[PDB]
Curated annotation (Swiss-Prot):
Protein name: High affinity transport system protein p37
Cellular component, GO, one term: plasma membrane
UniProt KW Flavoprotein keyword: no
Intracellular or extracellular location(s): Cell membrane
Cystine crosslinks: none
Keywords: Cell membrane, Lipoprotein, Membrane, Palmitate, Signal, Transport
This protein's record includes keyword Lipoprotein: yes
InterPro entries named among the record's database cross-references: CypI, CypI_dom_I, CypI_dom_II
Gene Ontology BP, a term: regulation of cell migration
Species in which this protein is naturally found: Mesomycoplasma hyorhinis
């Protein structure tokens, strides 16, 4: 059953919380509004129901968390100073494989669908022009390359300080996201990369240089590794093993820096990362040399958006009221926090193995 806890603390990213605009702790203000709205809806639900109206009313707080390992480790201690947080689904699945039932998944986030990827169940087939993942990449290129990202304006792609709204369909919630593989070069180099892909010439492809995220990343490492393995069958075992024998062919960097690196021409990223990346940023994101272009090659198989997880001993009735509070806050447009992270909706997890684990496992196969 677990103990009713009259104080609930959510872990939130440290960097995010202490981040600023104008010298101001903007996110502090956002989180306080969110916490107040949360507390009011929670206790209304709580007190409207006989099953829970006699417990103590609950206060809601946040605490900064350095990174996801700290979140999951600290939740696993089951210390009431940290009761809940929201984690990337793949990383959570891998953690729970190692530590079964140690923490309790309860909330599934959803995100506004991209106009180019509104259907979850599209998977790798053969890497040709007719491949569903290749078709999405071509739709991305119509948005990012044909209408060049560098010339997008806040006004004509509806930048709202958060995302370019014009690349989304808010009326459709996606209970998934994907990674993607970018390629960059002049015309001759792009053709050579595409030829190597088409010919399944892994050595040649790989030697164009691959940028990636950390090896525990789903969307900047593992999902793309799966596509490459499924495409260039028999040519390698794992990306880590391949890198250990070919180290100058790999570098850990964000895809939006690909254009700055002359010895790298392939990069992994979240699908549509440009959609929340302001093109005016001083980092000059996605900039390429004058006679080079960056374009999508293929996206990956889909996995669930982030999952909210509780320390094990929070009372079940309280967990379910907290889940419903997320849902109702989204419905009534009182969630000032979630949409800043891409969380545009929420659902209860009814079956973690089916709804999360099996989905993740199918994608990395
Ligand atoms: C407005 C906005 N939309 C989208 C994002 C991206 N995003 C937030 S949660 C999520 C899924 C989990 O991704 P990540 O935490 O990068 O884990 P990884 O795939 O590296 O394991 C992503 C793609 C964002 N940061 N901001
Ligand atoms: Br209250
Ligand atoms: Br109340
Ligand atoms: Br109830
Ligand atoms: Br503008
Ligand atoms: Br990463
Ligand atoms: Br590396
Ligand atoms: Br990126
Ligand atoms: Ca607590
Ligand atoms: Ca260019």
């Amino acid at each position: 059953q677990g103990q009713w806890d009259k104080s609930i603390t959510f872990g939130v990213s440290e960097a995010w919380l202490n981040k600023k605009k104008g010298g101001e702790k903007v996110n502090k203000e956002v989180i306080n509004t969110f916490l107040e709205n949360f507390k009011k809806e929670f206790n209304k639900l709580k007190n409207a129901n006989d099953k829970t109206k006699n417990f103590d009313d609950v206060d809601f707080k946040v605490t900064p968390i350095q990174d996801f390992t700290v979140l999951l480790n600290n939740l696993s201690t089951d210390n009431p100073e940290l009761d809940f947080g929201i984690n990337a689904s793949g990383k959570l699945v891998e953690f729970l494989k190692n530590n079964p039932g140690i923490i309790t998944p309860a909330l599934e986030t959803t995100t506004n669908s991209f106009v180019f990827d509104k259907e979850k169940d599209k998977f790798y087939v053969d890497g040709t022009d007719s491949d569903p993942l290749v078709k999405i990449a071509k739709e991305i290129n119509k948005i990012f390359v044909e209408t060049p990202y560098a010339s997008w304006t806040d006004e004509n792609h509806k930048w709202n300080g958060n995302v370019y709204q014009s690349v989304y369909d808010p009326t459709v919630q996606a209970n998934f996201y994907r990674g993607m593989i970018w390629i960059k070069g002049n015309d001759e180099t792009l053709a050579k990369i595409k030829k190597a892909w088409n010919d399944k010439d892994w050595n040649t492809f790989r030697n164009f240089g691959i940028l990636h995220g950390k090896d525990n990343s789903s969307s900047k490492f593992k999902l793309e590794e799966t596509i490459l393995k499924n495409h260039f069958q028999n040519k390698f075992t794992t990306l880590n093993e391949d890198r250990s024998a070919h180290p100058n062919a790999y570098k850990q960097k964000s895809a939006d820096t690909l254009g700055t690196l002359d010895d790298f021409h392939i990069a992994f990223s979240e699908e549509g990362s440009f959609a929340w990346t302001h093109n005016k940023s001083a980092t000059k994101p996605f900039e390429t040399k004058a006679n080079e272009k960056m374009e999508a090659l293929i996206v990956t198989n889909p996995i669930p958006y982030d999952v909210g997880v509780f320390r094990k001993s929070v009372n079940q009735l309280e967990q379910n009221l907290i889940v419903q509070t997320f849902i109702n806050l989204a419905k009534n447009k009182q969630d000032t926090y979630g949409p800043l992270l891409g969380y545009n909706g929420y659902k209860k997890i009814d079956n973690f193995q089916k709804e999360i684990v099996e989905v993740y496992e199918k994608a990395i196969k």
